[PDB]
């Protein structure tokens, strides 16, 4: 059942700490490694910066001949001497608050304009932002790999070295995302045109899908500018599919290059998306990796968690992200490649009290491994800091190797993990609720995001009213997922793409947050799910279009639903809850045929029904709610209770979060107080026990079954 | 010298609680009022919703004839019986998460298209958003005033009644701001044309300023779409000046109508701008009231503070907003018309332990009065809630008058306030730093804001690189003001408009965050300031343009400055601090004749100088830094120390914030812990422990 890392045929919690040799006095490297090992950590992790080691074009130093902290070889040897396994991350990009994101200054001065990401006008977006498939960029990247990869290969575990894992590049697409502009480099334009010709084969076939009138493929260009017609939406949809293939081509090229050096260790990649302490856009960025995860079962993706604080304001972000990684990568453990320790920026504090709670909450939320980022502070040598001289603050160790407050928090957490890992790693929560992940709603990084400078998608111009980004942020991430976690109902997330019917029928309920569009394959899957005995909850819309916004009424027809879309007050009544505020004036009005009406508009028109279809049950709500009122929690709770799903515990304070993890031998009860209140409460399993929990604090109770 | 409310001829801290009679079971009105009074509160505050009382056109109920909670008259009687003064807020707009923002449904169903705020295409922006100077809207507003104002007039403090203050409308421009669109209603456009003719007199004068090619004012159109040309910037700038006159015309029309009923109590207005627990846009919104504040010294503006939490993440917002209100309104107390109690949003928690600290921090930060918003929760009657059934959560009292956790926090704070008010209200901080407030940098709500749906202002299209909203948000509000607060250096803010030279001379340093444009009057003011002996810190640019982007180099020439704008790495060195991250590649590179170079690019070009001019001192930095590294705090500290300015205390833990407030005989030291850490420290001009997100106040007799 559970996915976890294994060592010596036993479950093993991966505990790594990030220690940047290049930012630490090499006379203190050993002390940093000893103090990390003394916390119970098994692994150390570092970037190997291209700029740091290719000091001028074709002049390499890995031995500290020109600066003692260029002695990568000695750092590798110390990791082995201090019995730590090593994760190496040689880029080409590292980010790492390093000048030019780790690319050499000499490189960026030499590269031609066509090596850079370009805007719609052909202008350079940023002087450190390359176009990934640039011939010149990949030539210099390969020359870098030619010098660093033999060193990595020599020091792998299979040659009795400490190196067990290597990250390829760093958060692919993060630089493009943060710039707020997409890449229109000519390599992108030309590879896109090849993609479209391969995809459609004839211009007649493309025109039939898009409803365009092109005479030839030579008339068609990568889409630019705002979406005004459904044909512009179609063009951008394919452009999103293309970018997923483009990032798969990039990582495939790096992987094939590294394998040529005899490097057989585990390859990793790291997922961006937290900003200002929440992760509602992370699902968009993880979706850009869809083709990499389909084609490379041997690259393990891990999350980059940057909570910044730990409170009800962001409590749901880490669990939703952990669940969405599991959905997209169900055969590998859920791990954090970067797991916040300290703060990347002086003005954004990172308190030990918060992060210690985050670490325990992460265990509650199913994490199987992590890399404390940053375990060790660094001091940039030679002006290499992007933003200042000091690299991170409020870490476990300062750059000198002094213990800071966070060290004691990590020791406490790691001690618990080491004591419990053989049982805890094998535990699961009992999820009776499955939530669908429909990746195409996330495919909007070119047209609609929190970071994109230009809003290119306005669905009203297309005759639609449900924006897929509004749906996936407010109705799903901040809405349903936040609500279920707040209500202490366990859920799983399943990727609906090529999804096995047998993997949905384990759940008492499947929840689908739907826009007006959904592909035929997914409409058919949800149809079969209900006909064969599944219980489906679907809102705010029965879809009637496919991903190209062409007619597709499969689910509507299979479920025998008739509806009209009508304007009314935002407030509806649902299951006897009055004044439920909904997101839209427009609602689906269902006729009551062979159904029980359960939701009504202010004019008493039917906007939600329940029915029995084949061996299954359907609940459809023709209105949108996330979690912006107490009525929304009441409605989620009522929906869950339709199939008699029960919480694992009765807890006297509804603002206490809990998670029960168990196997045949052991039960762990995690209590999380995400609130600035001392809470005294009682609980019992579904004679009560009393607990007092401080503000922003945790309790963990272990029972031997 | 301090400004404060007065009761019984003594300094009086205004402690008001918001209690919406229209959202409370009338059987429990007395119980809510008694529980509010038992916290030591002196005043209760409420809207009087137009929709609630004009139940159909020309059918008024203020006596509970049709619903017991329409008995406004009984509520007023209970306030008197329970010895509370009353603040009333009859609109016409109330917002208050009330359907139609408090306008009657029957009114919105009946109004013509031309009564509504319209976008660039002539479409209605929102079915509850009227154009303020709509004739139809003012006709019906006046008929509402005709019924509610005689009731207020009878019960006003000038007739020895309980009503001490009345708010006119609610956060003027807030609906416009939140809609993300500006009003192009044809009456508004006609008033804008009248405003332009009044301002320029002749089309030749307007053409000389804008570089336009009109033959007459008949050719003139309201600016729309993106700014591509400097002439489009000019038209939008005057469109901003016009909206400030427009809001003054609206509030003048309401005030004159109110005064006609013999209402001579204090009139108020309330300032919006907090969102997601910070207030970096509130200075833009307060700038929209510039003409109201200049023309109506009898209308007291108060702040609507919505911190949501209390930590280092938002510690600087309330101080900066309080200081900006003081700059724009120096002759009235700084007070919060809405002072967060509970939460408007169930999913956005408001912890009693957070807000208790916010209340004490607000005292440290110079607040003189406030209105707990919401003291009492409400239940929306008859589906009249904009949102769900319940109005506010985690308040002092629930809608049934049950005491909640916040009640005891408010009782505690109120007891400290009543014990200390006579001395505390007469205290000020000793500011030796003044920070300039240049209002034109804030006049962008039509073209650039956090809420505007399309950015119309792209300064690179105008041949500029310093965006005024970036400057005022990241370099000023979240940069310099946050850094000074964090470093525990007192500052004052001064409005540079019509500013007295005499008012700047008391300060040891004037800090000016400058874009490439600044009007002649302000350039002249800053020139005279330094020549006469003042010490000026100016960055990131010596301005070379006026507000119409026409050449204006008064300050530059008067100070003998020469520069070239050149591209370099973002990092500079300044005062021996290496690796100072700056916002722009473009920097001013100064000629150093008769100057001391003090900052350098990565290629060692001079991007900052110090100089003696007349009797004074100039420090100019040709680069933009906010607060995103420890080097930024070090640079601000180095700059303050150029004129030997000292903190009032030595505190062993640099992450403890303090404010020293004094008068001739009393000192209050407010220690504030904005961090999730128990901190132990000592202080001197003596060892204290403060819990996470908490406070300690110390008194010292002088
Ligand atoms: O916060 C925005 C982004 O900043 C980047 O520097 C981090 O590497 C990402 O993980 C993060 O999502
Ligand atoms: O077990 C001791 C731990 O208890 C938790 O409840 C607290 O949040 C931690 O601050 C503390 O280290
Ligand atoms: O948060 C955005 C705005 O919301 C409005 O409902 C409040 O009345 C304002 O004070 C506030 O700034
Ligand atoms: Ca000169």
Numbering used by the authors:
A (entry chain B): 6 to 691, 698 to 716
B (entry chain A): 6 to 690, 700 to 716
Give the text the authors published on this PDB structure.
The IALB_1185 protein, which is encoded in the gene cluster for endo-β-1,2-glucanase homologs in the genome of Ignavibacterium album, is a glycoside hydrolase family (GH) 35 protein.
When a crystal was soaked in a solution containing Glc, the electron densities of the Glc molecules were clearly observed in both subunits as the β-anomer at subsite +1 at almost the same positions as the DNJ molecule and the Glc moiety of Sop2. If two Glc molecules bound at both subsites −1 and +1, the 1-hydroxy group (β-anomer) of a Glc molecule at subsite −1 and the 2-hydroxy group of a Glc molecule at subsite +1 would collide.
